[PDB]
Scaffold this active site. Structure first.
Site, short mmCIF file in Angstrom:
data_model
loop_
_atom_site.label_atom_id
_atom_site.label_comp_id
_atom_site.label_asym_id
_atom_site.label_seq_id
_atom_site.Cartn_x
_atom_site.Cartn_y
_atom_site.Cartn_z
N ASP A 140 0.83 -1.22 0.00
CA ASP A 140 0.00 0.00 0.00
C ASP A 140 0.87 1.27 0.00
O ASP A 140 0.64 2.21 0.76
CB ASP A 140 -0.96 -0.02 1.20
CG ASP A 140 -2.10 1.03 1.11
OD1 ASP A 140 -2.37 1.60 0.00
OD2 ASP A 140 -2.76 1.23 2.16
N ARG B 100 -0.20 9.10 1.25
CA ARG B 100 -0.93 9.07 2.51
C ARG B 100 -0.28 8.17 3.56
O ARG B 100 -0.60 8.29 4.75
CB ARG B 100 -2.38 8.63 2.29
CG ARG B 100 -2.51 7.20 1.71
CD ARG B 100 -3.95 6.77 1.40
NE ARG B 100 -3.90 5.45 0.76
CZ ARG B 100 -3.80 5.26 -0.55
NH1 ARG B 100 -3.80 6.31 -1.36
NH2 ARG B 100 -3.70 4.03 -1.05
N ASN B 101 0.62 7.27 3.16
CA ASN B 101 1.28 6.37 4.11
C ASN B 101 2.72 6.76 4.41
O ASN B 101 3.43 6.00 5.09
CB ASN B 101 1.20 4.91 3.60
CG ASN B 101 -0.13 4.25 3.95
OD1 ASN B 101 -0.75 4.58 4.96
ND2 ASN B 101 -0.59 3.34 3.09
#
Ligand SMILES: CS(=O)(=O)N1CCC[C@H](NC(=O)[C@H](CCC2CCCCC2)NC(=O)c2ccc(CNC(=O)c3cnn(-c4ccccc4)c3N)cc2)C1
Length: 302
Positions: free
Chosen positions: A156, A160-161
């Site tokens: 992922d 955003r991570n």
């Protein structure tokens, strides 16, 4: 895995950072951290500055499932030791409540950070230069290079991570879909399971094959985000179902698959680097060691 627990008594609460169903995350200051560096706690002290940490704590009434999730998260994090991956500074697991201690990254996630900046135009709110955008991307590639040597697939990777600290430092993390902010970036499949389809290589969507080579595809989309200053979702004009169709066109390979377009002011050679990350054949995508060297060099000459 640590030999001893971090001493709970040395954590001084300052504020709640976040709240969940089975736990909370607190901002804490550590008393006299120099004592703990001598015991192989990876704390980076200064001189006149306090030492801040983030502490994730299980609620005393947490279910057995939540406790299982927490213990496995600790196990995974205990392996990862790199300047651009989030770091497990310590644990409290000899007794309840269970705690994990990580870096405190005061500027939030990289999507939040870049959305708040404008690109600097030296030829003419807060700004950020093109060399610094490349330095950010180089740091992401260096962290993924490290994961690749452990044969660890992130699955992922996206802005955003990634977390932002002082002096534009970046550390890769994984929050999943646990914050409500990014629900539009995930597509629901089986039951509660979701998939970040707009970052996923064609073979991940069609067959569920996740590899380091598909992390490279996701890095191409993440680089696109950075150079867009996070102003738009990938394939924003297309539906989730149309993105899934596109994976089928990559498989058929009859010249009708489509690509993210070149960001405004993105050099052509850098767009071609993204395109190579999106090669149909996984063995034609560049390795993270090459992506790192390329971006680090341009960061210094641009
Ligand atoms: C089904 S799943 O398996 O895919 N799953 C879904 C759900 C998530 C699971 N995540 C994992 O297990 C991975 C660890 C493994 C991961 C492996 C790849 C490389 C990165 C690490 N946990 C993490 O990253 C992780 C763990 C603990 C914290 C606590 N600290 C803060 O919160 C923190 C700090 N500063 N500020 C902050 C400060 C000021 C302003 C804003 C923010 C925080 N708010 C943060 C991140 C994975």
């Amino acid at each position: 895995m640590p030999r001893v627990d971090f001493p709970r008594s040395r954590l001084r609460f300052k504020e709640k950072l976040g709240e969940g169903q089975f736990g909370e995350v607190h901002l804490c200051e550590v008393d006299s951290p120099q004592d703990l560096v001598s015991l192989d706690f990876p704390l980076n002290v200064r001189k006149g500055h306090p030492l801040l940490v983030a502490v994730k704590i299980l609620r005393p009434d947490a279910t057995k499932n939540a406790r299982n999730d927490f213990l496995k998260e600790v196990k995974i994090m205990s392996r990862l030791k790199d300047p651009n991956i989030i770091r497990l500074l310590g644990v409290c697991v000899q007794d309840d409540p269970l705690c994990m201690i990580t870096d405190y990254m005061e500027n939030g996630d990289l999507n939040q950070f870049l959305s708040a900046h404008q690109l600097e135009d030296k030829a003419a709110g807060p700004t950020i230069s093109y060399p610094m955008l490349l330095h950010v991307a180089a740091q992401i590639a260096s962290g993924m290079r490290y994961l690749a040597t452990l044969n660890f697939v992130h699955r992922d990777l996206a802005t955003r991570n990634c977390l932002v600290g002082e002096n534009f430092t970046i550390k890769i993390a994984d929050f999943g879909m646990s914050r409500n902010l990014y629900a539009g970036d995930y597509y629901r499949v089986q039951g509660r399971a979701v998939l970040p389809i707009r970052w996923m290589a064609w073979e991940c969507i069609l067959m569920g094959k996740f590899t380091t080579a598909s992390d490279v595809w996701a890095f191409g989309v993440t680089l696109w985000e950075v150079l867009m200053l996070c102003r738009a979702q990938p394939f924003g004009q297309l539906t989730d179902e149309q993105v899934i169709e596109n994976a089928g066109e990559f498989f058929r390979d009859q010249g009708r698959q489509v690509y993210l377009s070149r960001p405004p002011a993105c050099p052509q050679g850098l767009y071609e680097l993204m395109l190579r990350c999106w090669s149909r054949e996984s063995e034609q995508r560049p390795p993270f060691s090459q992506l790192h060297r390329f971006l680090a060099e341009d960061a210094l000459n641009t």
